[PDB]
Amino acid sequence: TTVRVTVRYFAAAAAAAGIETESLEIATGTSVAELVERLGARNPELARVLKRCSYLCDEVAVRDMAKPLVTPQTVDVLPPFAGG
Amino acid sequence: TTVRVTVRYFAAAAAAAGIETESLEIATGTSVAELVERLGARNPELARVLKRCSYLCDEVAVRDMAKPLVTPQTVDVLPPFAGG
Amino acid sequence: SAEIVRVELTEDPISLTEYEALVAAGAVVGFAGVVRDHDGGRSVLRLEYSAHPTAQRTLEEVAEEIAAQSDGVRAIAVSHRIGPLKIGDAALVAAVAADHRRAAFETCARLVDVVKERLPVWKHQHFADGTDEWVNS
Amino acid sequence: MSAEIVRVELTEDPISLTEYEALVAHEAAGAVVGFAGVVRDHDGGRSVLRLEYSAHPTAQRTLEEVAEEIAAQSDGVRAIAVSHRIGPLKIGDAALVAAVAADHRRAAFETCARLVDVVKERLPVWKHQHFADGTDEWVNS
Numbered sequence: 001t002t003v004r005v006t007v008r009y010f011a012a013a014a015a016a017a018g019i020e021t022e023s024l025e026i027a028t029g030t031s032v033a034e035l036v037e038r039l040g041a042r043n044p045e046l047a048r049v050l051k052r053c054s055y056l057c058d059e060v061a062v063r064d065m066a067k068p069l070v071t072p073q074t075v076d077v078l079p080p081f082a083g084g
Numbered sequence: 085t086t087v088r089v090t091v092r093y094f095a096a097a098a099a100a101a102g103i104e105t106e107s108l109e110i111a112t113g114t115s116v117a118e119l120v121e122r123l124g125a126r127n128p129e130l131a132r133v134l135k136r137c138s139y140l141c142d143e144v145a146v147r148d149m150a151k152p153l154v155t156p157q158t159v160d161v162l163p164p165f166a167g168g
Numbered sequence: 169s170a171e172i173v174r175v176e177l178t179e180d181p182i183s184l185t186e187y188e189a190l191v192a193a194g195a196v197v198g199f200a201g202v203v204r205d206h207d208g209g210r211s212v213l214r215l216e217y218s219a220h221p222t223a224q225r226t227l228e229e230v231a232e233e234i235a236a237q238s239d240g241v242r243a244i245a246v247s248h249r250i251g252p253l254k255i256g257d258a259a260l261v262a263a264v265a266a267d268h269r270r271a272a273f274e275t276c277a278r279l280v281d282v283v284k285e286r287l288p289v290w291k292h293q294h295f296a297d298g299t300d301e302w303v304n305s
Numbered sequence: 306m307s308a309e310i311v312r313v314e315l316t317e318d319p320i321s322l323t324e325y326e327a328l329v330a331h332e333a334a335g336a337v338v339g340f341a342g343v344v345r346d347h348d349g350g351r352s353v354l355r356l357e358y359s360a361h362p363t364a365q366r367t368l369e370e371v372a373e374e375i376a377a378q379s380d381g382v383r384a385i386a387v388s389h390r391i392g393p394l395k396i397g398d399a400a401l402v403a404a405v406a407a408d409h410r411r412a413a414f415e416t417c418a419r420l421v422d423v424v425k426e427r428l429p430v431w432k433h434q435h436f437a438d439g440t441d442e443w444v445n446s
Binding site: 094095096099133136143160162163164165166167168 | 342358359360361362363389400401421424425426427428429430431432433443444445446
């Protein structure tokens with residue numbers, strides 16, 4: 001089957017994606033890593049930005065990019081920080 | 085035979101001496117150390133404060149306490165610093 | 169057991185003066201990180217800071233981490249501005265009050281470093297040649 | 306070139322970190338670090354009612370010499386400012402204020418602390434405290 005994942009893009013990622021948010025359908029068990037590969041498949045600028053991003057699942061830091069996505073959830077895309 | 089020296093007391097020294105300044109006749113050739121001895125004879129409190137003082141002759145730091153006083157001069161009595 | 173007086177991200181201009189007043193100890197050290205008119209060899213016109221929704225909490229967590237590990241520090245306050253900023257505006261302000269100056273200097277410095285490392289905010293610079301850059305993208 | 310010395314003051318008038326920070330910050334440099342040394346209401350386990358700072362006549366010149374040395378060492382420091390108050394002071398009053406503007410924060414923090422260090426070491430000023438029990442003390446005498 002499939003699962004519906006909401007993706008929220010931030011900063012450079014949102015600029016490169018051309019959108020702020022996006023709902024995606026992916027095979028159940030798809031890893032965050034695979035998801036990321038998919039997000040940049042048709043957008044070289046986004047793909048490049050994603051190379052340096054970190055990720056949240058329901059605003060919790062993703063420690064394991066191999067973590068399977070089995071339930072609907074929100075993935076936040078976070079470029080390298082640049083405060084101060 | 086003698087030379088006239090002006091002594092300026094500062095902070096704790098002035099407080100212990102009871103005065104800010106005095107003029108003094110001392111034997112020509114008297115060292116700064118010998119002068120300090122005579123200044124301290126005033127009272128034990130001043131004598132006590134003088135132990136930890138530094139000294140200027142015409143506002144030039146006294147490096148050698150054996151320095152002879154052979155010309156009319158101003159001697160400044162400087163307690164340990166305490167500012168900031 | 170240092171107090172965290174105030175911690176906030178805001179669009180409103182932030183005052184180092186106000187924050188040094190907040191932490192008022194015998195020694196106060198304040199820091200302001202200010203928008204420069206250049207980035208390397210390029211002239212800067214203006215910038216914007218944007219923040220993740222978790223930014224506020226993260227800044228609170230950092231401040232508490234620094235406060236807990238410190239010693240001789242009485243009060244800490246730190247703020248990061250977000251939104252459009254002009255050259256000369258303070259983007260990041262922090263103040264530390266301590267019983268002695270050494271603890272104030274050392275804690276304020278480490279505090280600023282950890283905030284810069286961990287605060288989920290982003291910087292969008294705009295250059296005089298009409299180009300722009302997302303810093304560290 | 307050496308860093309600007311925007312303020313170097315021995316004054317009886319009240320001093321403010323606030324004005325000093327604004328003055329060094331005009332360079333629009335990357336980082337500003339400020340220090341305020343304020344009078345505590347307690348010292349060595351004794352409650353302080355008030356204190357006074359006194360200065361040797363050479364204090365102003367000594368402060369200027371210190372400022373020149375600090376301003377010379379070039380670590381991307383753009384502006385410095387330092388002031389020490391003398392005369393009668395109340396609890397909470399700033400006794401010593403310094404500010405440093407630099408390209409980056411490392412030089413600002415390190416230079417501001419070093420400036421305060423050298424000033425406290427070399428400035429010919431003295432502190433007279435007055436305690437609640439009616440006794441007084443010339444610090445370090």
